[PDB]
Design a protein around this ligand. Structure first.
Ligand code: 3NY
Length: 249
């Protein structure tokens, strides 16, 4: 991983030590970026709903993850399931159970720093993973992206500034998450997010993530070329808000 400080250094150290999940996958791979483009062609707003029991940007939410994921199967283009243990209060078992219960694409959200965690995502049933530019060197990013694609996954490459975007293009990202929250300070900068979105080539599948809370914002971002919208805490609180994000109120 890159030289890191503070909580990022801590979470990367923890992830390096994460024991692997050693069972065979029992689920097809279903492409999250292809389904996003299908929604686009169908003029259906594409929301990637996240399940996260906690995050550094929100309070813990104790809801049944299965009931949540079955509800979202009706509406969302894909689910993102936060599996990191210390800061997201996640578990591989929650991912495994959700993947066993739903037939929409699933992204495993965690801090992926070694190949065995991509083996884990595949074996647990996730269709794809995020890879985070801020924590991985270019060589690790390239290696892990190639590794994930050898399983038939197309990872979301997470960026939050111009440096990250330059590295995403350099490693041949096809599917970019433009995160409006800086991982290190937790600050949201939407002006920067919109600038980055305007700099991405039109053939890359773009997900705007973090701080999206209104149908109007989604409509604005769609007009700038964004393909899909990742939304976590507002849906962890009120899953039915997803109906207004897709259909208006
Ligand atoms: O909780 N999540 O599943 C999840 C998904 C994507 C994200 N991007 N930035 N933070 C994120 C958290």
């Amino acid at each position: 991983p890159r030289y890191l400080k503070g909580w990022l250094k801590d979470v990367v150290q923890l992830s390096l030590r994460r024991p692997s999940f050693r069972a065979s996958r029992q689920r097809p791979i279903i492409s999250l970026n292809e389904r996003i483009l299908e929604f686009n062609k169908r003029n259906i707003t594409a929301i990637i709903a996240a399940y996260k029991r906690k995050s550094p940007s929100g309070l813990d939410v104790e809801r049944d993850p299965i009931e949540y994921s079955k509800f979202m199967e009706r509406y969302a283009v894909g689910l993102a399931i936060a599996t990191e243990e210390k800061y997201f209060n996640g578990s591989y078992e929650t991912l495994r159970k959700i993947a066993s219960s739903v037939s929409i694409p699933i992204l495993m959200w965690d801090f992926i720093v070694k190949e065995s965690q991509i083996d884990d995502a595949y074996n647990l049933g996730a269709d794809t993973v995020a890879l985070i530019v801020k924590i991985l060197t270019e060589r690790e990013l390239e290696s892990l992206l190639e590794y994930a694609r050898s399983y038939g996954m197309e990872p979301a490459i997470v960026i939050n500034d111009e440096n990250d975007l330059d590295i995403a293009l350099r490693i041949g990202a096809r599917f970019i998450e433009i995160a409006s929250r800086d991982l290190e300070t937790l600050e949201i900068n939407k002006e920067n997010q919109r600038k980055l979105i305007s700099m991405i080539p039109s053939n890359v599948v773009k997900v705007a993530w973090q701080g999206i809370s209104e149908r109007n914002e989604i409509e604005e971002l769609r007009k700038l070329g964004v393909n899909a919208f990742g939304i976590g805490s507002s849906l962890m609180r009120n899953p039915e808000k997803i109906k207004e994000f897709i259909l208006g109120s």
